[PDB]
Structures are given as structure tokens and as C-alpha cells.
């Protein structure tokens, strides 16, 4: 919050124009998927790759 | 090859018949056809036939099993 002054030589004012309280809000979202994804076969794959590490 | 083979399945249509020596000739040039053509597969191993401590399966080779036909 922010705020300001007034600036009035006198004390007994009591009644004036005031200030005013406004909320603000900061939104946070998801994104997009992040997607690797192959097709093969598994045994020209798995000739010199186990497990597939 | 392919002249004697037609040979063989034209004369009937002139209806006559092949003589022993057309039919030796005809056997031999295919013969030599399939010399030509033959390929022979040879057999892999099944898959799950263990490839053995000697061949260093834990850093030169990477699979503990055979991979198996392609």
C-alpha cells in the first residue's frame, strides 16, 4: 500500500477529504507441457542399449 | 535360363514334345540360374541366451543377453 499527505496550517479538522484503500493482486500461472517423445524399435534399440539409460 | 523355360511352355501350343537331351540343357542353365540366385540365412541367437563374463557385458558391451533377430 501507498499513501499521501495533506498539508493545512490548522488542527481542528476533524471533517476533510481523506485518502482511500485499494488491494492490488499479482496472478501466476501454469504453462505448456514440456514434451519429449520417440518411437522406435525395441530391438535395433536394445542391439547396444540396455535399460535404455 | 529363361529361353529354355519359355521353350518348355510353348511347345505345347504347336503340340509336340521336348526331347531328353532340350530337357537336360534346360536342367543344367537352370541349375546355373539357381547357383546364381542361392542365399543361404544363417540363425541368430534366441534372446535371452546369456553372452557371458568374458565378453566384459559390465564396460565393453553394454547387454547382458543377446538382442535377438532384428
Do not use: C, W
Given at each position: ?53 | ?38 542365399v543361404v540365412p544363417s540363425m541368430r541367437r ?22 535377438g533377430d532384428l
Amino acid at each position: 500500500h501507498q499513501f499521501s499527505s495533506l498539508r493545512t496550517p490548522t488542527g481542528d479538522i476533524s471533517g476533510q477529504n481523506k485518502n482511500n484503500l485499494i488491494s492490488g493482486k499479482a496472478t501466476g500461472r501454469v504453462g505448456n507441457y514440456i514434451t519429449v517423445a520417440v518411437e522406435y524399435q525395441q530391438l535395433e534399440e536394445a542391439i547396444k542399449l540396455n535399460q535404455l539409460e | 535360363a529363361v529361353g529354355y523355360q519359355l521353350l518348355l511352355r510353348m511347345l505345347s501350343d504347336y503340340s509336340l514334345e521336348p526331347t531328353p537331351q532340350v530337357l537336360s540343357n534346360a536342367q543344367r542353365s537352370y541349375d546355373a540360374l539357381m547357383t546364381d540366385t542361392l542365399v543361404v540365412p544363417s540363425m541368430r541367437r534366441r534372446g535371452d541366451f546369456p553372452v557371458g563374463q568374458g565378453n566384459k557385458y559390465d564396460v565393453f558391451t553394454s547387454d547382458r543377453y543377446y538382442p535377438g533377430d532384428l
